[PDB]
PDB file of all heavy atoms in Angstrom:
ATOM      1  N   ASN S  21      18.646  24.360  -3.684  1.00  0.00           N
ATOM      2  CA  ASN S  21      19.887  23.814  -3.157  1.00  0.00           C
ATOM      3  C   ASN S  21      20.242  22.539  -3.911  1.00  0.00           C
ATOM      4  O   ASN S  21      19.405  21.940  -4.591  1.00  0.00           O
ATOM      5  CB  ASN S  21      19.793  23.527  -1.653  1.00  0.00           C
ATOM      6  CG  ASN S  21      21.146  23.558  -0.971  1.00  0.00           C
ATOM      7  OD1 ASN S  21      21.970  22.665  -1.165  1.00  0.00           O
ATOM      8  ND2 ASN S  21      21.384  24.590  -0.171  1.00  0.00           N
ATOM      9  N   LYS S  22      21.505  22.132  -3.779  1.00  0.00           N
ATOM     10  CA  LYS S  22      22.007  20.988  -4.533  1.00  0.00           C
ATOM     11  C   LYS S  22      21.528  19.669  -3.934  1.00  0.00           C
ATOM     12  O   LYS S  22      20.821  18.897  -4.589  1.00  0.00           O
ATOM     13  CB  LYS S  22      23.537  21.025  -4.587  1.00  0.00           C
ATOM     14  CG  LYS S  22      24.138  22.421  -4.561  1.00  0.00           C
ATOM     15  CD  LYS S  22      23.877  23.172  -5.858  1.00  0.00           C
ATOM     16  CE  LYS S  22      23.804  24.672  -5.615  1.00  0.00           C
ATOM     17  NZ  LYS S  22      22.493  25.083  -5.042  1.00  0.00           N
ATOM     18  N   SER S  23      21.907  19.395  -2.681  1.00  0.00           N
ATOM     19  CA  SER S  23      21.621  18.106  -2.061  1.00  0.00           C
ATOM     20  C   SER S  23      20.833  18.242  -0.762  1.00  0.00           C
ATOM     21  O   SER S  23      20.848  17.319   0.060  1.00  0.00           O
ATOM     22  CB  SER S  23      22.915  17.329  -1.809  1.00  0.00           C
ATOM     23  OG  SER S  23      22.639  16.029  -1.319  1.00  0.00           O
ATOM     24  N   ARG S  24      20.160  19.376  -0.545  1.00  0.00           N
ATOM     25  CA  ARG S  24      19.210  19.458   0.559  1.00  0.00           C
ATOM     26  C   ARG S  24      18.054  18.487   0.364  1.00  0.00           C
ATOM     27  O   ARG S  24      17.622  17.832   1.319  1.00  0.00           O
ATOM     28  CB  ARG S  24      18.665  20.878   0.695  1.00  0.00           C
ATOM     29  CG  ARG S  24      19.402  21.756   1.686  1.00  0.00           C
ATOM     30  CD  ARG S  24      18.528  22.927   2.102  1.00  0.00           C
ATOM     31  NE  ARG S  24      17.694  23.392   0.999  1.00  0.00           N
ATOM     32  CZ  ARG S  24      17.237  24.630   0.877  1.00  0.00           C
ATOM     33  NH1 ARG S  24      17.499  25.557   1.781  1.00  0.00           N
ATOM     34  NH2 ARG S  24      16.497  24.945  -0.182  1.00  0.00           N
ATOM     35  N   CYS S  25      17.555  18.382  -0.862  1.00  0.00           N
ATOM     36  CA  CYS S  25      16.426  17.529  -1.202  1.00  0.00           C
ATOM     37  C   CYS S  25      16.945  16.174  -1.660  1.00  0.00           C
ATOM     38  O   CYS S  25      17.676  16.088  -2.653  1.00  0.00           O
ATOM     39  CB  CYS S  25      15.584  18.191  -2.291  1.00  0.00           C
ATOM     40  SG  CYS S  25      14.073  17.343  -2.757  1.00  0.00           S
ATOM     41  N   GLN S  26      16.572  15.122  -0.939  1.00  0.00           N
ATOM     42  CA  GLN S  26      17.008  13.771  -1.263  1.00  0.00           C
ATOM     43  C   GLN S  26      15.934  13.043  -2.061  1.00  0.00           C
ATOM     44  O   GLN S  26      14.748  13.087  -1.719  1.00  0.00           O
ATOM     45  CB  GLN S  26      17.343  12.991   0.010  1.00  0.00           C
ATOM     46  CG  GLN S  26      18.610  13.467   0.702  1.00  0.00           C
ATOM     47  CD  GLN S  26      19.837  13.345  -0.182  1.00  0.00           C
ATOM     48  OE1 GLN S  26      20.606  14.296  -0.330  1.00  0.00           O
ATOM     49  NE2 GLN S  26      20.026  12.172  -0.776  1.00  0.00           N
ATOM     50  N   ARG S  27      16.363  12.373  -3.125  1.00  0.00           N
ATOM     51  CA  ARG S  27      15.462  11.704  -4.053  1.00  0.00           C
ATOM     52  C   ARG S  27      16.214  10.536  -4.683  1.00  0.00           C
ATOM     53  O   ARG S  27      17.268  10.119  -4.193  1.00  0.00           O
ATOM     54  CB  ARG S  27      14.934  12.701  -5.092  1.00  0.00           C
ATOM     55  CG  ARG S  27      13.496  12.479  -5.518  1.00  0.00           C
ATOM     56  CD  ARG S  27      13.126  13.380  -6.678  1.00  0.00           C
ATOM     57  NE  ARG S  27      11.866  12.984  -7.293  1.00  0.00           N
ATOM     58  CZ  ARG S  27      11.756  12.073  -8.249  1.00  0.00           C
ATOM     59  NH1 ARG S  27      12.814  11.437  -8.724  1.00  0.00           N
ATOM     60  NH2 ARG S  27      10.553  11.790  -8.739  1.00  0.00           N
ATOM     61  N   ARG S  28      15.668  10.000  -5.775  1.00  0.00           N
ATOM     62  CA  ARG S  28      16.264   8.842  -6.428  1.00  0.00           C
ATOM     63  C   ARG S  28      16.428   9.053  -7.930  1.00  0.00           C
ATOM     64  O   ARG S  28      16.283  10.173  -8.429  1.00  0.00           O
ATOM     65  CB  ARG S  28      15.443   7.580  -6.112  1.00  0.00           C
ATOM     66  CG  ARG S  28      13.913   7.673  -6.271  1.00  0.00           C
ATOM     67  CD  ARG S  28      13.429   7.881  -7.693  1.00  0.00           C
ATOM     68  NE  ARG S  28      11.982   7.974  -7.797  1.00  0.00           N
ATOM     69  CZ  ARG S  28      11.339   8.207  -8.932  1.00  0.00           C
ATOM     70  NH1 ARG S  28      11.987   8.329 -10.079  1.00  0.00           N
ATOM     71  NH2 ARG S  28      10.016   8.319  -8.916  1.00  0.00           N
ATOM     72  N   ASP S  29      16.729   7.975  -8.651  1.00  0.00           N
ATOM     73  CA  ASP S  29      16.961   8.058 -10.085  1.00  0.00           C
ATOM     74  C   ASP S  29      15.644   8.091 -10.857  1.00  0.00           C
ATOM     75  O   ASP S  29      14.709   7.337 -10.577  1.00  0.00           O
ATOM     76  CB  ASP S  29      17.813   6.877 -10.543  1.00  0.00           C
ATOM     77  CG  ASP S  29      19.249   6.984 -10.074  1.00  0.00           C
ATOM     78  OD1 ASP S  29      19.662   8.095  -9.679  1.00  0.00           O
ATOM     79  OD2 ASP S  29      19.960   5.959 -10.093  1.00  0.00           O
ATOM     80  N   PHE S  30      15.591   8.967 -11.857  1.00  0.00           N
ATOM     81  CA  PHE S  30      14.387   9.239 -12.625  1.00  0.00           C
ATOM     82  C   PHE S  30      14.614   8.829 -14.076  1.00  0.00           C
ATOM     83  O   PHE S  30      15.751   8.691 -14.534  1.00  0.00           O
ATOM     84  CB  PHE S  30      14.026  10.732 -12.537  1.00  0.00           C
ATOM     85  CG  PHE S  30      12.583  11.046 -12.798  1.00  0.00           C
ATOM     86  CD1 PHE S  30      11.665  11.048 -11.764  1.00  0.00           C
ATOM     87  CD2 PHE S  30      12.153  11.381 -14.072  1.00  0.00           C
ATOM     88  CE1 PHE S  30      10.340  11.357 -11.996  1.00  0.00           C
ATOM     89  CE2 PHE S  30      10.829  11.684 -14.313  1.00  0.00           C
ATOM     90  CZ  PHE S  30       9.921  11.674 -13.274  1.00  0.00           C
ATOM     91  N   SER S  31      13.511   8.619 -14.793  1.00  0.00           N
ATOM     92  CA  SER S  31      13.544   8.343 -16.223  1.00  0.00           C
ATOM     93  C   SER S  31      12.195   8.733 -16.809  1.00  0.00           C
ATOM     94  O   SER S  31      11.192   8.744 -16.093  1.00  0.00           O
ATOM     95  CB  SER S  31      13.850   6.868 -16.503  1.00  0.00           C
ATOM     96  OG  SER S  31      15.223   6.585 -16.299  1.00  0.00           O
ATOM     97  N   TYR S  32      12.171   9.050 -18.103  1.00  0.00           N
ATOM     98  CA  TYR S  32      10.935   9.516 -18.722  1.00  0.00           C
ATOM     99  C   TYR S  32      11.069   9.481 -20.234  1.00  0.00           C
ATOM    100  O   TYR S  32      12.154   9.265 -20.781  1.00  0.00           O
ATOM    101  CB  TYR S  32      10.566  10.933 -18.265  1.00  0.00           C
ATOM    102  CG  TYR S  32      11.667  11.951 -18.450  1.00  0.00           C
ATOM    103  CD1 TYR S  32      11.669  12.810 -19.541  1.00  0.00           C
ATOM    104  CD2 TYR S  32      12.695  12.068 -17.523  1.00  0.00           C
ATOM    105  CE1 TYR S  32      12.671  13.748 -19.709  1.00  0.00           C
ATOM    106  CE2 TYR S  32      13.690  13.000 -17.682  1.00  0.00           C
ATOM    107  CZ  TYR S  32      13.679  13.834 -18.773  1.00  0.00           C
ATOM    108  OH  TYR S  32      14.687  14.756 -18.912  1.00  0.00           O
ATOM    109  N   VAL S  33       9.936   9.699 -20.900  1.00  0.00           N
ATOM    110  CA  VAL S  33       9.848   9.768 -22.352  1.00  0.00           C
ATOM    111  C   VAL S  33       9.102  11.044 -22.716  1.00  0.00           C
ATOM    112  O   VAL S  33       8.076  11.365 -22.103  1.00  0.00           O
ATOM    113  CB  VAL S  33       9.137   8.534 -22.943  1.00  0.00           C
ATOM    114  CG1 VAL S  33       9.069   8.626 -24.459  1.00  0.00           C
ATOM    115  CG2 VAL S  33       9.839   7.249 -22.524  1.00  0.00           C
ATOM    116  N   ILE S  34       9.620  11.776 -23.699  1.00  0.00           N
ATOM    117  CA  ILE S  34       8.980  12.980 -24.216  1.00  0.00           C
ATOM    118  C   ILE S  34       8.993  12.905 -25.736  1.00  0.00           C
ATOM    119  O   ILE S  34      10.029  12.602 -26.339  1.00  0.00           O
ATOM    120  CB  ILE S  34       9.682  14.254 -23.705  1.00  0.00           C
ATOM    121  CG1 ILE S  34       9.219  14.566 -22.282  1.00  0.00           C
ATOM    122  CG2 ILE S  34       9.404  15.445 -24.614  1.00  0.00           C
ATOM    123  CD1 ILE S  34       7.723  14.763 -22.156  1.00  0.00           C
TER     124      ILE S  34
END
Side-chain angles (χ1 to χ4, degrees):
Chain S
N21 205 289
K22 329 290 151 282
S23 185
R24 266 200 325 207
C25 184
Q26 289 300 130
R27 216 188 167 274
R28 47 66 180 177
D29 289 343
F30 203 89
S31 284
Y32 54 99
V33 181
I34 280 302

